[PDB]
Symmetry: D2
Subunit: 295 residues, 4 copies
Amino acid sequence: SAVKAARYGKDNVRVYKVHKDEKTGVQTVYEMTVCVLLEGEIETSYTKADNSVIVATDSIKNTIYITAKQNPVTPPELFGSILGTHFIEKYNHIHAAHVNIVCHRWTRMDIDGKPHPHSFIRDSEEKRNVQVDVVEGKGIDIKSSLSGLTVLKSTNSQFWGFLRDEYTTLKETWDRILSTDVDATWQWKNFSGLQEVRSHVPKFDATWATAREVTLKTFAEDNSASVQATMYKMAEQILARQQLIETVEYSLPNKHYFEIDLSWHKGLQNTGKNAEVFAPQSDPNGLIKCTVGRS
Amino acid sequence: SAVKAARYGKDNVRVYKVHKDEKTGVQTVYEMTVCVLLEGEIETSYTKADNSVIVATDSIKNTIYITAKQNPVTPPELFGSILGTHFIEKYNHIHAAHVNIVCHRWTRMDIDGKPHPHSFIRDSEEKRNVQVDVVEGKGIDIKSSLSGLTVLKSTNSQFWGFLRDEYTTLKETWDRILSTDVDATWQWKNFSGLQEVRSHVPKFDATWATAREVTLKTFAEDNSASVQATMYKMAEQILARQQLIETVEYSLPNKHYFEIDLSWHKGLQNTGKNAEVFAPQSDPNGLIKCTVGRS
Amino acid sequence: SAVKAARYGKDNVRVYKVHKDEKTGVQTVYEMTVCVLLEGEIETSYTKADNSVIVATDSIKNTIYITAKQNPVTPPELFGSILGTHFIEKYNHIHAAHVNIVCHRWTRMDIDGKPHPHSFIRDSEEKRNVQVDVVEGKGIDIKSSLSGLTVLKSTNSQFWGFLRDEYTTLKETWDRILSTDVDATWQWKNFSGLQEVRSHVPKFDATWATAREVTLKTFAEDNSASVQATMYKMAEQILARQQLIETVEYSLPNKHYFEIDLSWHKGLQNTGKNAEVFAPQSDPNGLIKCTVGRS
Amino acid sequence: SAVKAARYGKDNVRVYKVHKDEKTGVQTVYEMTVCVLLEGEIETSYTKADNSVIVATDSIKNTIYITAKQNPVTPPELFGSILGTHFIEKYNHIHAAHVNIVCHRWTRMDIDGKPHPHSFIRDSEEKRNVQVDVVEGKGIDIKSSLSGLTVLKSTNSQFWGFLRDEYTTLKETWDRILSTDVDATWQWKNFSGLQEVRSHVPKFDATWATAREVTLKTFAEDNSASVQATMYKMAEQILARQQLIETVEYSLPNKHYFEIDLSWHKGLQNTGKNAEVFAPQSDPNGLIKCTVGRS
Ligand SMILES: O=C1N=C2NC(=O)NC(=O)[C@]2(OO)N1
Ligand SMILES: O=C1N=C2NC(=O)NC(=O)[C@]2(OO)N1
Ligand SMILES: O=C1N=C2NC(=O)NC(=O)[C@]2(OO)N1
Ligand SMILES: O=C1N=C2NC(=O)NC(=O)[C@]2(OO)N1
């Protein structure tokens, strides 16, 4: 037998960083969870008890903190690229570094209508993420995403005209609730190295902002024919607004809210045009995916 | 043997309600999770297989949905009072109804700077809750709360002057991070019944808003001597602003962020005045509680 | 305003301990999560920024580890009593210690039919817990429990004869699934101090074993009229088998498994006597509670 | 723009099935969570609001329950193959079905030393899973796994000889705790269709049992040089025992248990040979992966 694939490293590394402007007093905080997994000429650690090839995961952890001390942690695309590049440059025998970063929200508080210099609120469990794959000889591949953006619209969602056969019980509808948790990923053009990533730094925050804005506005404004049709519109708009993106992927649960027929109780009318009280369904859920690229 | 205490009912009942203004087109959504547990002359269901005394939990579920259809679901203090009152009035042998409501956030989206008529975002996992105990002959006891309000300040927190003995390793500090998940509860004067609750309806939303505002502003502005000292200030302010409250309770974790000494690596300075990168600690955590009333 | 109640301390303290028999080579492991909250003459920490009265939560953490090093950690009733007693004896101004322990399962592996001397499996997420309240002048109050014991029986559960009115849709049944997560608590006679707790040490493991055995056998063998009727039988049996218990409490969710009518599809029969495929319901759930004592 | 990838279906479908032997009275229960996602000529649902190509996710749910009624649900490899095959055969335009099944444990209770005919315990949160990809023209690709198997050994784990440089603080050790949550996957030879899957049915349960047995025995008995070295031994043994497997993958967290130096307190010795009390670390964690195949 032989090792066909291997990677290893440190997961779930929580990291906070503060920036303090001593002139203005304004402080800014960043909090992440980081995973770094390495690949390379490490097979003998598995096959021969050869630990000499292992950069200890504890050392990978130390390196994450050191790198955060010595570099900006924002945008996460940049920090992940710096971190991944470090491992392939420092260790001859390491040939790929796979860096995942989850960024947690710390939004500055407004107190009495004024932004506070050092107090923050977790205003959403929504995350901003990156997956940065630094592969020796093959540059830097970056996937950026937003996830855990939970939304609901109470009308202007429809679902009719779907296939009907002997397995079908679902009624067509022209007016339903639509709710989802948005997971949206944009995949960047391959970058040749850290210089090229740095050269595009402003585009990372700008493209995240675009993706979020497009997601919310399209969700709110599209009189939706289906989750499929709405998510495609989001993706095509994001592609149109950043040429350095190659694809946009959405993964959307359809978090169902069922009508409750109450007509058995005193003829109460709570369906169709009279539907006011609904039963949110925890499970099961539709799950709708697509990846959109350019033609 | 004998039944010393008993209660039973339906937990984890998810409820959505929509209000539609047909004139303006503006829709407003509410989402809750409800628990109703009943007490009364039910001991024989336990001791003698006497199901005649059991209002089925399935029926309690139905009743929650019917009550939501026929009544406002806001403020939750009112809805819980209506719901609890129903059970003690409808069923002679039921003498208490214990209603817990967790309200989930659905905040109206702003799209292109304008509030959208039917689209919403879960802008925080923060909850607004009530515990409404309707006890026959003993009125309606209401505890209101906010929970899951997660905050951090990056300075203007201190902790020195604490007891030091042979069990103590903690260094005094004059400048640390403070982060918590706020759970704040205000306990209302007993209400005689549903008329008295209704007579105070505006005070419920107003007092929740006050509690939240005071919590945030005191957290942001207090140069904190301890979690104890800061939370007491919050409680005393809330009591001063609503005379129909009897007590305010806080339960606050101290979610520790540890400095990381990096001086072993190239003399890097990351402690004290040079501390920028910290290790958030998932566990353990301080847990600080108090209940404040009037003297 | 004034402090009506206060307690504080360290929560979520994970603790492992190993015992090594050097003669036999057999090792035995224990893993817990511990919370210790203190009460006493601490109000000035809240009202006056007086930290002198605070035994730091960090010190409470240290004390938990030191106490585990210097004492047995089993049975948890004993360890919690030692730990709580320490705080009220060491600190004049501390008058109560509230110790919660969750014990995690590490069951010794059997390999090739033989117990392994140092390898263990988390064979269930079931917990064994204690709540030990050491109150100066008022002895030691202990509540022991098992929780997270998840069970299902596929028949020999019934539910008929319940109240039927205009809120009722539930069909009577003479054959249904019953599934629950058992939370069972036994409350000990007050103990005067640590000598009296020690004098009863064997009874702690024995009573936990009895409670678990009775729970499982009664669940399996009772042709159940209701959750109420079955849980009462469990409680009365446990009381009969340990006179140093005063009460037994159960809290049981009714984790519903719904029939699925498939007769719309090719006349498939999947209800009543033909019911084979069911839809487990995540929510809502019945929740049934009682506390049984002696007459 | 154009659809580069798309799949959709129903996730989180909870399914229970009972088998009743009317002769013996013995009942046997199965509980799963199922996801089915479809691919095919569905792009127009995204690009043109063409719902005619969508088999509704609600219908996919119905189909899961119908298929469970009409077929065995065990082994899960077979059930998933039947279910996936159904969609590609029934719907001309559907060309792949991706079926994920998580099997939940319901282990028969032993009461008074005898197996009970209809009562079960969730004896572990360990899962048995399958991923069955039925792709038209490309047969049936099955990945089987066990996951959530949580283990600890208290000695006979070592970690020394790893790379040491300016990023390294970790001390070498010749005696440490090793704990992990095992996720082990075996990938089957491609099967041509449902006849070939059926022809190998006994091998599914047998290979799962082998994988579990090998995992536990190797973990317990290997005086481990590293997680890497131990997991490789597991994989090579499983490959040697089933020739219809092509690869075995492990993904193992290193769930760290740190020594606690207590020498600052009364010279207490709790490190090295005297280490008895440890601090389990919730995060971060090493994460070690490999895929082993034949040479
Ligand atoms: O039953 C369904 N209802 C749905 N709604 C939808 O927008 N698209 C689907 O394909 C669907 O996803 O959940 N299937
Ligand atoms: O070690 C401690 N550090 C703390 N900080 C604090 O504000 N109060 C405490 O009592 C303390 O709670 O966590 N104990
Ligand atoms: O609808 C109900 N079905 C139940 N079954 C039961 O055993 N007791 C109840 O009181 C009940 O609890 O869930 N209510
Ligand atoms: O610090 C480390 N300690 C480890 N132990 C191990 O078995 N292998 C590693 O590669 C290691 O994984 O966690 N890195």
